[PDB]
């Protein structure tokens, strides 16, 4: 689909069997979700944003469905203010910026 | 143009007679540029993201050229690790997300 930016680019995603709202964020290298439980082994990591760095849990090879399209990759979980879909998964669904 | 997301979507912008590289960020509501002296009145403002909040200065009706496309809007200035073009200006150049 074509998504204009007059509003936040929010989409529904399906992960771990749950439905969640997420922002298609071209300004994030990674995908970061709010605290939640995901299966598998996780390792501690730190990421940076506009107001500093935070600690997150990294889960590898996690299947995620973004607005229908399928992706499988790294998902970070931690105290982010909103669920974010970053470039690591946006590239998998063939997303581009056009103008 | 069509920009792929394999790498950060950086482009050249023109503001106040200066050329800079800025990240096209569909994940930012506003445009935030790294510290730079801009003439004109401004208002104090706090904006937040991952990690917390930073204090910035808000300037209005600032002409900005994004890859040859003319736009004019609000520009926030503060200690941001990178120059960021947000939705307020992206909508002006008819930028869309497509997949």
């Amino acid at each position: 689909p074509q998504i204009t930016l007059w509003k936040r680019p929010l989409v529904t995603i399906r992960i771990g069997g749950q439905l969640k709202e997420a922002l298609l964020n071209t300004g994030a290298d990674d995908t970061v979700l709010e605290e939640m439980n995901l299966p598998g082994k996780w390792k501690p990591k730190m990421i940076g944003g506009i107001g500093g760095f935070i600690k997150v849990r990294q889960y590898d090879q996690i299947p995620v469905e973004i607005c229908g399209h399928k992706a499988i990759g790294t998902v970070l979980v931690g105290p982010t203010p909103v669920n974010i879909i970053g470039r690591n998964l946006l590239t998998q669904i063939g997303c581009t910026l056009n103008f | 143009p069509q920009i792929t997301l394999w790498k950060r979507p950086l482009v050249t912008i023109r503001i106040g007679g200066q050329l800079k590289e800025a990240l096209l960020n569909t994940g930012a509501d506003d445009t935030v540029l790294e510290e730079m002296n801009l003439p004109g009145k401004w208002k104090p403002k706090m904006i937040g993201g991952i990690g917390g909040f930073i204090k910035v200065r808000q300037y209005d009706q600032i002409p900005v050229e994004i890859c040859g496309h003319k736009a004019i809007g609000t520009v926030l200035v503060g200690p941001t690790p990178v120059n960021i073009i947000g939705r307020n200006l992206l909508t002006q150049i008819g930028c869309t997300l497509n997949f």
Binding site: L23, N25, G27, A28, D29, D30, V32, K45, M46, I47, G48, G49, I50, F53, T80, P81, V82, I84, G86 | L23, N25, G27, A28, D29, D30, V32, I47, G48, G49, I50, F53, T80, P81, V82, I84, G86
Partner: peptide, 10 residues
Amino acid sequence: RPGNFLQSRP
């Protein structure tokens, strides 16, 4: 209000 979600790794 949280409105700028820039994000990157170290």
